[PDB]
Ligand binder design. Structure first.
Ligand code: DGD
Ligand code: CLA
Ligand code: CLA
Ligand code: PHO
Ligand code: LMG
Ligand code: LMG
Ligand code: LMG
Ligand code: LMG
Ligand code: BCR
Ligand code: BCR
Ligand code: LMT
Ligand code: MST
Ligand code: OEC
Ligand code: CA
Ligand code: CL
Ligand code: FE2
Lengths: 57, 37, 114, 37, 38, 490, 82, 341, 34, 32, 65, 35, 34
């Protein structure tokens, strides 16, 4: 949910993308500039939904 | 026969040769005015 | 035979005639507009892109605080006040299309301040 | 028959193999998306 | 009348200011001309 | 030893194996032709020349065979759509058959010329070493070409001793193979006049025969033989390529803009016909004529031949499509089945509205309806919040004349809009999307592909010319340079 | 390192040079200036004057719409101006 | 010997600005092209052509000025000063955008002449012509983009107009209409130009910081032997550096330099082919598998679908004043727009 | 998903064929005596 | 099927990387 | 070498190898057709481009039968 | 040395030098046009 | 017809792969000096 409006943008191969379209999506806008380390989420499921991987990367 | 655009073609075909002319004229001339060896 | 073999890793002298190089290039344009100093050549070779990209990076870092590009929208106007378009305006339309369509559902208000 | 005297041997060094493959593979990573379209 | 007489460094700083002047006239023209917006 | 990209230099002066090579290539190009044919014959559907002609089926080779006469199949059918015709031996099957054999023979020939590479004919009596007198060769070959060029125009295109060529009216409705009489007048230089294709080959053929002889007799002025490093085959190449890519940039232009050589009934419409509403005007012209002779709107439009209406559909515009949108035009919008009919839109007041058509440039375009004076009267809104022209608020309706939907009218907004949404592409048709499992995304016609392919190859060949040419004028400095330090001081 | 031409450096310094160009340069300048300031340029290039894009009322553009009768069409566009 | 060899003699004479046979073609054109631009940029307008002010005389600045293309009515007409259009008249020619085909066609020959020059000068000086091979790349770009492209479209009107801003719209257009950024060939293009500007920078620095000391000064520039001899920088040290920081490193200056010719020339060649295809509109616009899933399933969203919507907006909001000859009228209600904006 | 059927084989042969080419050479080079 | 093809090529490029860095032809000086 | 029937019969056609005409041979005569061809192309080009119109020659799908 | 004046270099230099100043003059004048 | 989608690629790689194998060897054998 890149834009923080609960409208998930899937950007990975296994979820319908190809090399050209696929991408790692930016952290949520709900998050803004806040630090979002994995240990800041109730779960990974929550972390992958708010674009946690983006920051770690 | 010889329509307006046909006349223009000549005008450009003639105005073209002239340019090639004066150019090779001037050139061939100045060329033959120095080159000693 | 591959023209490449004509070079051995760990050579003492040079593998090309930098004087013949300069000789040709100096004649293409004109002598003083050509390098003969390999060191000055290579400095330029590095200086140019690095300096240019430095500015491009400062551009994105600068437009990160909303100091954007030149805005010549409706600059040239005629004797009555009518707006005479320039290519700068045709560019604005293409920009509006992008503005007006990006992030469909994310905006709730008039001005895009974010 | 006479052993034709116009032949030379052919060569491809290891580095060229690598440079080659790097090109083939990435082109493939670049065009596969459009092949599957 | 040849052979350098007018000192180069002066030919430059003079031809130089001379350009900052014309190129500067252009920049002024940007807030007044037709390229204005007013 | 040799870098991979030079392995073929092993022939630069082995006339024997050079011919062995060139023989194998011809074999493959001939072979390809034969089998590309069979592939089309195994998949081309002759069931309908009106709405499903070769150019809708991604046929590429089949058209070039009709342009010169071959228009039938041993199985009975024929390109024009006739029956009972007897193509004889020269049917598409025949042509395909022929090439496959010519290929097998050129193969065997390539083998023989490879093993017997050292024939004396390639050794110069004087130097006793391999050599080919290019200048005389060129003269000979050029003689044969013009001799053949001549014959082609003289006997084939004229019908004297041959079929003729494809000729059609101004709106690809009548096309066929017909004998064409020469044309030396001025209008014979008009790309769209068949007579010019005949005259050309007869004249150019002769000029070609003369010029050949010249070159078979007169020798090359020393000055030139030196300048153009003749007697160095790798220069014959640099020049040929320059010619080959010139030929290419030209065929690409005549395919895209159209000419008596790339007829629409064989390669498809032009992007330019759609641009200038070419066929739209021919239809109207006809419809208004029928109304003059006191016919009804139904009768007028019903008179309009399906084939004609079909050319007035943006889905046959070669300018629509994509680079990786593969296949025939049918994998796109589907196999055309029938013309639904002319759609006339009107609004509550009876006023007749008009659908703004889709310019080739646009992948997607909006539905806007205006009257004769171009005033926007109705449209399909994005943000309904403040729509003033919704089909609903305007009572827009649609009526059809001639075709499947002839005589019918539709008034429920959705259905009206559906058709309005279609009007955008020109004449509305009925497609069979099942069969080919179409996706509904426009693909380009053979006219389009041939054009793309040749424009690229040409532009690519330019580079070859510049490369080989350079490599001919600088053979000496190849491998590197050497000594002195002269530069500035003549 | 040399050719026939007289080393720019020498020329850009020769009082003769300036004696010539102090006249020539401003000459060319004042000429072009007048080219614009006399309105001549506008006619040499058919370029509209601030008061010649549209007719008083019209807000439409004088778009040339057909090649061959273009020049003719352009002339008529000048007709509405005034 | 004879007038020809005397004509030659003169031309191939080593002056300040080498003329040569080639010059007979280069200079006439090259100057006319540059001249016509500089002329239009300041004097000719694009009103009768695009309904646009395009010269200093009208108020445009160095960014907004330009020599705009001819009307769409002209089609692909060569628009000769004395042709059916202008009819010998000069001012009309100017107003019908005759100056475009002028700059275009002239500059075109000028690029031929120039490459020939390289070829001619190379030969004289006795060096290999790899400077000419290289320059094929820029020719291809100019040829495919300023000629082949519009030759495939409706007319010269859709070719890039000569000017700074007037080129940016050419860019925006291609995104919006051809979705050019998604094209395999444009990508290769950039990989080459971007990758070429890397070799440039990287090689330069590798040399300047891998130099031997041949002087006692800090400003090591003077310490260079214009007259060959030893390598001025440690090719052996450079090899070890990169071999330890990047893992891979050159070790054959002959190859390292050929590579530098290849990368950016190949890149531009590819970017050309992509455009030669955009001429026929045979673009790389969409991915069918993506569109099909987006149709049936409303919750599927990729950065790709997102982009396509940006294109729709570009096309809808630009088309009107960008294609005047189409007398487009798009009611406010038909204009695609997100919420609020 | 809804991809092209030939995409797989087009990509496979696009990688294999030329790679197999290079490899044939490199190995035949590599094994040349001296 | 597509995913597999994309990952495979990627996996192949990384393999190449390895061999290129660790199995290059040792770069020899002078003698050659 | 290896002579052959066909080989001998064709032996003449390929033998005058380096044989060149002297000086500027036919060059000038050639430089004229060359210039003629150049003008010929410009014409047919300009005709296709409708820059050179000629009543009688109508460069469209029309003028067809 | 005894350098000449009118040379090939001179011609070129002026073909660009002369027009330029003429334009810089033209443009400098435009800065005052208005409405 | 109604065949297997992978049949084509299964047959292609089944022929290519081992053929490419043999060929790599034969050529590297063939080019071994003396
Ligand atoms: C290294 C490279 C060095 C390059 C050096 C280049 C030097 C000079 C280049 C000259 C270019 C001339 C271009 C001429 C042209 O565009 O001429 C165009 C005209 C055709 O013109 C078009 O015709 C169109 C309309 O066709 C329609 O309307 C017509 C009647 O008007 C007929 O009815 C026709 O059948 C129907 O389809 C429209 O009127 C267009 O506006 C009009 O421009 O003739 C023709 O092209 C004849 C064309 C021969 C073309 C050779 C093309 C080479 C590459 C092409 C790539 C295409 C993509
Ligand atoms: C030379 C021109 C040429 C042209 C114009 C055509 C045109 C056409 N063919 Mg044909 N064909 C050709 C040669 C050609 N073919 C050859 C040599 C073969 C033998 C393999 C075939 C075999 C063939 C078959 C089997 C079929 C066709 C079909 C068709 C139609 C296909 C529509 C399509 O999907 O295109 C698609 C166009 C492309 C995918 C081109 C994209 C090329 C890109 C992806 C790669 C370029 C390579 C590389 C990556 C570049 C990198 C370089 C590096 C230095 C950077 C079309 C009219 C079809 C048909 O008849 O349908 C009804 C059909 O079934 N063709
Ligand atoms: C039209 C005829 C033609 C002919 C007879 C040649 C012949 C030759 N070229 Mg040349 N070339 C041509 C056109 C032609 N070229 C064009 C149009 C270009 C511009 C792209 C080039 C660019 C070019 C370069 C840059 C070089 C040559 C070189 C050579 C020599 C290479 C020796 C070799 O082992 O090849 C080796 C070929 C291969 C190992 C395989 C290439 C595999 C890929 C790229 C393509 C596979 C294509 C496919 C099977 C079918 C293509 C069909 C075609 C119509 C598109 C050879 C004498 C080389 C040279 O001068 O060496 C001294 C060299 O460096 N050429
Ligand atoms: C768009 C950016 C770009 C520009 C402006 C540019 C410019 C130039 N490159 C040259 C050379 C080169 N460029 C090369 C590789 C490359 N060049 C690249 C990109 C560029 N190269 C790239 C990406 C590559 C990698 C392949 C090489 C290998 C060379 C050379 O050897 C050559 C050189 O000598 O280096 C300095 C110079 C050739 C001079 C000439 O031929 O005059 C003759 C033609 C003239 C004078 C005018 C006619 C040209 C017409 C078409 C232009 C009209 C343009 C208007 C006047 C202005 C337009 C306004 C714009 C805003 C659109 C020239 C200054
Ligand atoms: C603390 C809690 C942490 C929870 C994490 C949960 C992750 C869940 C992912 C998920 O549910 O995916 C569900 C998805 C999607 O699966 C796809 O869904 C699509 C519709 O959304 C379609 O139906 C596709 O056809 C379907 O394949 O994932 C997978 O199929 C994943 C296979 C994943 C293999 C992962 C390997 C990771 C390896 C790591 C290191 C290897 C060495
Ligand atoms: C002599 C040999 C010359 C050889 C090659 C010359 C190439 C010349 C390019 C000239 C561009 C001139 C632009 C100009 O004059 O603009 C004149 C304009 C117009 O400015 C506008 O004029 C209008 C009236 O005409 C109105 O007054 C507007 O309000 C005003 O803004 O330019 C500027 O204001 C320009 C600031 C430009 C800064 C440019 C840097 C360019 C660097 C180019 C290459 C660098 C290396
Ligand atoms: C005297 C009269 C002689 C008449 C002969 C007629 C033969 C007709 C064959 C026919 O109609 O087939 C019709 C068929 C069947 O075509 C198939 O029909 C099936 C249903 O029956 C399905 O619809 C298949 O999808 C469809 O492909 O033939 C072809 O498609 C044939 C392509 C044939 C290519 C033949 C090449 C022969 C080459 C010979 C030497 C080459 C070198
Ligand atoms: C500088 C660089 C310059 C590069 C220039 C590059 C290319 C110029 C290309 C011109 C191409 C003309 C291509 C026609 C293709 C075609 O018709 O395909 C036709 C096919 C068939 O496509 C199918 O057709 C069916 C009806 O018959 C249906 O329409 C199907 O839906 C459709 O998918 O499509 C494709 O092949 C796409 C192929 C992508 C292939 C990549 C192949 C790589 C092969 C490598 C080695 C092979 C060894 C054997
Ligand atoms: C071309 C060129 C160049 C150029 C340059 C220039 C152009 C310069 C200029 C300069 C200048 C132009 C300068 C100036 C300076 C100044 C100063 C340093 C000043 C000071 C001042 C003061 C201190 C003041 C004061 C005052 C007053 C006046 C008034 C009252 C008050 C007061 C007191 C405040 C160069 C060399 C680079 C190089 C080569 C080329
Ligand atoms: C021996 C013999 C025989 C037989 C024969 C045969 C049977 C043959 C065949 C043949 C064949 C069967 C052939 C084929 C060929 C083919 C070809 C030649 C192909 C080609 C291809 C290509 C070239 C491709 C490419 C491409 C691609 C893939 C993609 C992109 C684009 C392009 C196009 C580039 C007989 C009985 C007569 C007798 C005598 C002997
Ligand atoms: C120098 C190199 C020149 C290359 C081509 C030159 C072509 C000249 O072409 C010729 O130009 C003159 C104007 O100067 C035209 O003369 C025409 O334009 C002027 C305005 O300029 C009108 O006032 C005049 O009534 C009209 O006939 C000729 O009709 C045209 O045929
Ligand atoms: C040594 C050859 N001369 C030479 N000169 C120049 N001059 C410019 C201005 C392009 C940097 N460049 C090069 S290539 C980096 N070479
Ligand atoms: Mn991603 Ca910068 Mn348009 Mn507010 Mn959001
Ligand atoms: Ca006023
Ligand atoms: Cl969103
Ligand atoms: Fe270097």
């Amino acid at each position: 949910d890149i834009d923080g409006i609960r409208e998930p943008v899937s950007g990975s191969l296994l979820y319908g993308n190809n090399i050209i379209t696929g991408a790692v999506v930016p952290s949520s806008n709900a998050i803004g500039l806040h630090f979002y380390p994995i240990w800041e989420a109730a779960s990974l499921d929550e972390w992958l939904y708010n674009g946690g991987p983006y920051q770690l990367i | 026969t010889i329509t307006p655009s046909l006349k223009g073609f000549f005008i450009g075909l003639l105005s073209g040769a002239v340019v090639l002319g004066l150019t090779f004229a001037v050139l061939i001339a100045i060329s033959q005015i120095d080159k000693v060896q | 035979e591959s023209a490449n073999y004509g070079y051995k890793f760990g050579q003492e002298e040079e593998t090309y005639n930098i004087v013949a190089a300069h000789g040709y290039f100096g004649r293409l344009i004109f002598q003083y507009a050509s390098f003969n100093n390999s060191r000055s050549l290579h400095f330029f070779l590095a200086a140019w892109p690095v300096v240019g990209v430095w500015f491009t990076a400062l551009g994105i870092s600068t437009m990160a605080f909303n100091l954007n590009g030149f805005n010549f929208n409706h600059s040239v106007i005629d004797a009555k006040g009518n707006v005479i378009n320039t290519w700068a305006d045709i560019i604005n339309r293409a920009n509006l299309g992008m503005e007006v369509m990006h992030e469909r559902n994310a905006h709730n208000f008039p001005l895009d301040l974010a | 028959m006479e052993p034709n005297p116009n032949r030379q041997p052919v060569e491809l060094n290891r580095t060229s193999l690598y440079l080659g493959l790097l090109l083939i593979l990435v082109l493939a990573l670049l065009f596969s998306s459009y092949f599957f379209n | 009348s040849e052979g350098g007489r007018i000192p180069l460094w002066i030919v430059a700083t003079v031809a130089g200011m001379g350009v900052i002047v014309i190129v500067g006239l252009f920049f002024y023209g940007a807030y007044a001309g037709l390229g204005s917006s007013l | 030893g040799l870098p991979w990209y030079r392995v073929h230099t092993v022939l630069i002066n082995d006339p024997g194996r050079l011919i062995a090579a060139h023989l194998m290539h011809t074999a493959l190009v001939a072979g390809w032709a034969g089998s590309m044919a069979l592939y089309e014959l195994a998949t081309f559907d002759p069931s309908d020349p009106v709405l499903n002609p070769m150019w809708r089926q991604g046929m590429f080779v089949l058209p070039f065979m009709a342009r010169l006469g071959v228009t039938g199949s041993w199985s009975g059918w024929s390109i024009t759509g006739e029956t009972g015709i007897d193509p004889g031996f020269w049917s598409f099957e025949g042509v395909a058959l022929a090439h496959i054999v010519l290929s097998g023979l050129l193969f065997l020939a390539a083998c023989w010329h490879w093993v017997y590479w050292d024939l004396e004919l390639f050794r110069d009596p004087r130097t006793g070493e391999p050599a080919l007198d290019l200048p005389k060769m060129f003269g000979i070959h050029l003689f044969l070409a013009g001799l053949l060029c001549f014959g082609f125009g003289a006997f084939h295109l004229t019908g004297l001793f041959g079929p003729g060529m494809w000729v059609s009216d101004p709106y690809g409705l009548t096309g066929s193979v017909q004998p064409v009489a020469p044309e030396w007048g001025p209008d014979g230089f008009n790309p769209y006049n068949p007579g010019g294709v005949v005259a050309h080959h007869i004249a150019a053929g002769i000029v070609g025969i003369i010029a050949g002889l010249f070159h078979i007799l007169v020798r090359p002025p020393q000055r030139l033989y030196k300048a153009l490093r003749m007697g160095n085959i790798e220069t014959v190449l640099s020049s040929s390529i320059a010619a080959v890519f010139f030929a290419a940039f030209v065929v690409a232009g005549t395919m895209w803009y159209g000419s008596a050589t790339t007829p629409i009934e064989l390669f498809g419409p032009t992007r330019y016909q759609w641009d200038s509403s070419y066929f739209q005007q021919e239809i109207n012209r006809r419809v208004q004529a029928s109304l003059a002779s006191g016919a009804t709107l139904e009768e007028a439009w019903s008179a309009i031949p399906e084939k004609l209406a079909f050319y007035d559909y943006i889905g046959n515009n070669p300018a629509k499509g994509g680079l990786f949108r593969t296949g025939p035009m049918n994998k796109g919008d589907g196999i055309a089945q029938a013309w639904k009919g002319h759609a006339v839109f009107r609004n509550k007041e009876g006023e007749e509205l008009f659908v703004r058509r889709m310019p080739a440039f646009f992948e997607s375009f909006p539905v806007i309806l205006t009257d004769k004076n171009g005033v926007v009267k109705a449209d399909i809104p994005f943000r309904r919040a403040e729509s003033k022209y919704s089909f609903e608020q305007q009572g827009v309706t649609v009526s059809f004349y001639g075709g499947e939907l002839n005589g019918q009218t539709f008034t429920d907004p959705p259905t009206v809009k559906s058709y309005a949404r279609k009007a955008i592409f020109g004449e509305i048709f009925e497609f069979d999307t099942e069969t080919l499992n179409s996706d509904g995304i426009f693909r380009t016609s053979p006219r389009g592909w041939f054009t793309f392919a040749h424009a690229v190859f040409a532009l690519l060949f330019f580079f070859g010319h510049i490369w080989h040419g350079a490599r001919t004028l600088f053979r000496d400095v190849f491998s590197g340079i050497d000594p002195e330090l002269s530069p500035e001081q003549v | 390192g040399t050719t026939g031409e007289r080393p720019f450096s020498d020329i850009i310094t020769s009082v003769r040079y300036w004696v010539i160009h102090s006249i020539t340069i401003p000459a060319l300048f004042i000429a072009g200036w007048l080219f614009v300031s006399t309105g001549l340029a506008y006619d040499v290039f058919g370029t509209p004057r601030p008061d010649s894009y549209y007719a008083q009322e019209q807000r439409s553009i004088p778009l040339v719409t057909d090649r061959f009768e273009a020049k003719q069409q352009v002339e008529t566009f000048l007709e509405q101006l005034k | 010997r004879g007038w020809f060899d005397i004509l030659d003699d003169w031309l191939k004479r080593d002056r300040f600005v080498f003329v040569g046979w080639s010059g007979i073609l280069l200079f006439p054109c090259a100057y006319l092209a540059l001249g016509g631009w500089l002329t239009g940029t300041t004097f000719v307008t694009s009103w009768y052509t695009h309904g646009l002010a395009s010269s200093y005389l009208e108020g445009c600045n160095f960014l907004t000025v330009a020599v705009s293309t001819p009307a769409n009515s002209m089609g692909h007409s060569l628009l000769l000063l004395w042709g059916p259009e202008a009819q010998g008249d000069f001012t009309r020619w100017c107003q019908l955008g005759g100056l475009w085909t002028f700059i275009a066609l002239h500059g075109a020959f000028g690029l031929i002449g120039f490459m020939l020059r390289q070829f001619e000068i190379a030969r004289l000086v006795g060096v290999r012509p790899y400077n000419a091979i290289a320059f094929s790349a820029p020719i291809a770009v100019f040829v495919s983009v300023f000629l082949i492209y519009p030759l495939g479209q409706s007319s010269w009107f859709f070719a890039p107009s000569f000017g700074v801003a007037a080129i940016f719209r050419f860019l925006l257009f291609f995104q919006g209409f051809h979705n050019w950024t998604l094209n395999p060939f444009h990508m290769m293009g950039v990989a080459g130009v971007l990758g070429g500007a890397l070799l440039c920078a990287i090689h330069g620095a590798t040399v300047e910081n891998t130099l031997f000391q041949d002087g006692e000064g800090a400003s090591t520039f003077r310490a260079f032997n214009p007259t060959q001899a030893e390598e001025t920088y440690s090719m052996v040290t450079a090899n070890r550096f990169w071999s330890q920081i990047f893992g891979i490193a050159f070790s054959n200056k002959r190859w390292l330099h050929f590579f530098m010719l290849f990368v950016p020339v190949t890149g531009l060649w590819m970017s050309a082919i992509g455009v030669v295809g955009l001429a026929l509109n045979l673009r790389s616009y969409d991915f069918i598998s993506q569109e099909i899933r987006a149709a049936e399933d409303p919750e599927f969203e990729t950065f790709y679908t997102k982009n396509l919507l940006l294109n729709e907006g570009i096309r809808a909001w630009m088309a009107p004043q960008d294609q005047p000859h189409e007398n487009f009228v798009f009611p406010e209600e038909v204009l695609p727009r997100g919420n609020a904006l | 998903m809804e991809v092209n059927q030939l995409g797989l084989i087009a990509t496979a042969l696009f990688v294999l064929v030329p790679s197999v080419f290079l490899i044939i050479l490199y190995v035949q080079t590599e094994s040349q005596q001296k | 099927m597509e995913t597999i093809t994309y990952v495979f090529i990627f996996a192949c490029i990384i393999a190449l990387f390895f061999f290129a860095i660790f199995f290059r032809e040792p770069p020899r000086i002078t003698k050659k | 070498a290896r002579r052959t029937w066909l080989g001998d019969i064709l032996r003449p056609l390929n033998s005058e190898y380096g044989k060149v005409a002297p000086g500027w041979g036919t060059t000038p005569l050639m430089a004229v057709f060359m210039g003629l061809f150049l003008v010929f192309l410009l014409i047919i080009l300009e005709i296709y481009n409708s820059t050179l119109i000629l009543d009688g020659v109508n460069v469209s799908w029309k003028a067809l039968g | 040395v005894s350098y000449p004046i009118f040379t090939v270099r001179w011609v070129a230099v002026h073909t660009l030098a002369v027009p330029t100043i003429f334009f810089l003059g033209a443009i400098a004048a435009m800065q005052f046009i208005q409405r």
